[PDB]
Amino acid sequence: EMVRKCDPHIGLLHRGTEKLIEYKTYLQALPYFDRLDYVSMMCNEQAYSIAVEKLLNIQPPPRAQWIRVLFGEITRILNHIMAVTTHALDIGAMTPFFWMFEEREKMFEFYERVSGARMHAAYIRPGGVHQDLPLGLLDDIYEFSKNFSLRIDEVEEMLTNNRIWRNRTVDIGVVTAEDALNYGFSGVMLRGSGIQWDLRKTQPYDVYDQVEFDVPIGSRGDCYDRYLCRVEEMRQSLRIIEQCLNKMPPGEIKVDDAKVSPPKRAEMKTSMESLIHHFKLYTEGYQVPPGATYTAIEAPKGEFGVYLVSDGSSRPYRCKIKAPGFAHLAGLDKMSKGHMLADVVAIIGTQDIVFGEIDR
C-alpha cells in the first residue's frame, strides 16, 4: 500500500479554452475565466480585467477598485472554505463541510444579489464592474462578516488540536523551500514552507496597497502547517473586508471611456454618440492596442496569471493561462515520495486543485 510512483494523468477536463478564446472578442471571452477556476470565480476574472486594462492603458475607477478587492476577499473565503472542508471530508472528518457550506451559500447570496448569478458572475469586466452594489449589500456583508469568525473558530475547535488530525497531516507532504521554488510552486505551497512571498504585498494590484493584512508563513512545511496557513488567510480576508467596507468610496464604477465600457442605458436611449458606442461595443468590441503582457494575481489558490498577446484587433491573438495548480500537481510525485495511499489522498488536498484551471 506504499506509493512508489505517482503519474497524474490529466486532460480529462480539457476543452480547449485557450483556442476558443482566440475566436471571441475581449468582452466575449470574460465568461471563460469565471469557469477556469470555478471555485474562485471573481479572482480569475479580476486577473483577466487587470490584464486587459494594462493593454488598454486605462485605469479602473476608485469605487470599482475597492469593490473588486472586497469581492476578491469574499472569493478567497469561498476558496479556502472549499479547500479546507473538502480536504477534511476526504481525510475523514465530515461535519465541518456541512457547517461551512451554509456560509458558502450566504456568500453565494451576496454574489447573486450583486451580479445576478450565484457563481460565474462575470461581474468584473475590463474597465471596472458591470453594475454598482445594490443598496444594503454592504449592510448584509457586515452582518455576515461580524459572525463568520465564530464559525471558523468552531471549525478550528474541531480540527486544530485533534490528535487524529495532527497525526493524519503533520510531517506529510513536506516540501523544502528551494525544491518548491524550483518546482514552480506558488501561494501557500510556498508560504507554508517559510518562504515570505505574497503578490498582494510584494507587487500590489488594485487597492491591496492601502489595506493592512498579515501573511501567514509556516515553519515545518507540511499539510498541517498549510491548513493553519489557509485558516489564517481566511481571518486576514475578514480583516481586509472590514477595511474595504469602512473605506468604500463614492463615484462611478466603470472607466468613464465610452469606447471601452458600455454607456448607461439612459444615455444609450437619448444620445447619438452613446448609442453608436453601445452598438459597436456589443458588436465589434474594443480594439486593444497591439502588445503582449503577463499579468499575475494572488488567486485564492496561488498565482493565477494571463499571458495575453494582442495584434490590434478586437479579439486576442493568444491567451495563455498560467494556472496556480499546474506546477503543484506536477510536484505531487516529489511530495508523495515515501508515503502511503492515505497520505497521498491527504497530499492532494493541500494542493487545493481545481481541474478546470489545471486543464484550461
Residues 196-225 as x/- pattern, contact with another protein by CB under 8 A: xx---xxx--------xxxxxxxxxx--xx
Residue 93 phi, psi (nearest 5): -65, 130
Between CA 123 and CA 129 the distance in angstroms is 6
User: What is residue 80's three-state secondary structure?
Assistant: helix
Between CA 95 and CA 213 the distance in angstroms is 30
Return the sign of the alpha-carbon dihedral for residues 55, 128, 32, 263: negative
Q: Which of 90, 154, 342, 355 is the binder for another protein (CB under 8 A)? A: 154
Residues 88-127 as x/- pattern, contact with another protein by CB under 8 A: -------x---x--x------x--xxxxxx--x-x-----
Question: Whole-number minimum distance, CB 91 to another protein, in Å?
Answer: 14
Between CA 287 and CA 310 the distance in angstroms is 9
- Nearest to another protein of 90, 171 (CB atom): 171
User: Do 1 and 290 form a contact (C-beta atoms < 8 A)?
Assistant: no
Question: Whole-number minimum distance, CB 296 to another protein, in Å?
Answer: 7
The window from 36-44, 50-58, 73-81, 337-345 that contacts another protein (CB under 8 A) reads 50-58
Question: Whole-number minimum distance, CB 34 to another protein, in Å?
Answer: 9
Between CA 308 and CA 36 the distance in angstroms is 16
Question: Whole-number minimum distance, CB 78 to another protein, in Å?
Answer: 17
Residue 40 CB neighbour total at 10 angstroms: 30
The window from 41-49, 195-203, 336-344, 348-356 that contacts another protein (CB under 8 A) reads 195-203
Question: Whole-number minimum distance, CB 322 to another protein, in Å?
Answer: 4
Long-range CB contact pairs, 307-314, < 8 A, 24+: 308/51, 308/52, 308/55, 310/55, 312/287, 312/288, 313/287, 313/288, 314/25, 314/26, 314/284, 314/285, 314/286, 314/287, 314/288
Residue 182 is a binding residue for another protein (CB under 8 A) = yes
User: Do 78 and 104 form a contact (C-beta atoms < 8 A)?
Assistant: yes
Q: Which ranges of 137-187 does DSSP label H, i.e. alpha helix? A: 137-159, 163-169, 177-183
The three grid cell numbers given for residue 304, joined into one nine-digit string: 493565477
Strands 318-322 and 124-125, sheet pairing: unpaired
Residues 60-79 as x/- pattern, contact with another protein by CB under 8 A: -x------------------
Q: Which of 53, 206, 352, 357 is the binder for another protein (CB under 8 A)? A: 53
Residue 327 is a binding residue for another protein (CB under 8 A) = yes
Q: Which of 1, 4, 5, 161 is the binder for another protein (CB under 8 A)? A: 161
Question: Whole-number minimum distance, CB 171 to another protein, in Å?
Answer: 11
Binding residues: 223, 229, 244
Q: Which of 3, 104, 171, 293 is the binder for another protein (CB under 8 A)? A: 293
Interface residues for another protein in 6-25 (CB under 8 A)? 9-11, 14, 16, 18-20, 23-25
Burial class (CB in 10 A: 0-12, 13-18, 19+), 151: middle
Residue 338 is a binding residue for another protein (CB under 8 A) = no
Residues 248-267 as x/- pattern, contact with another protein by CB under 8 A: x-xxx--xxxxxx-x-xxxx
Residue 80 is a binding residue for another protein (CB under 8 A) = no
Binding residues for [4Fe-4S] cluster: 223, 229, 244
Residue 134 is a binding residue for another protein (CB under 8 A) = yes
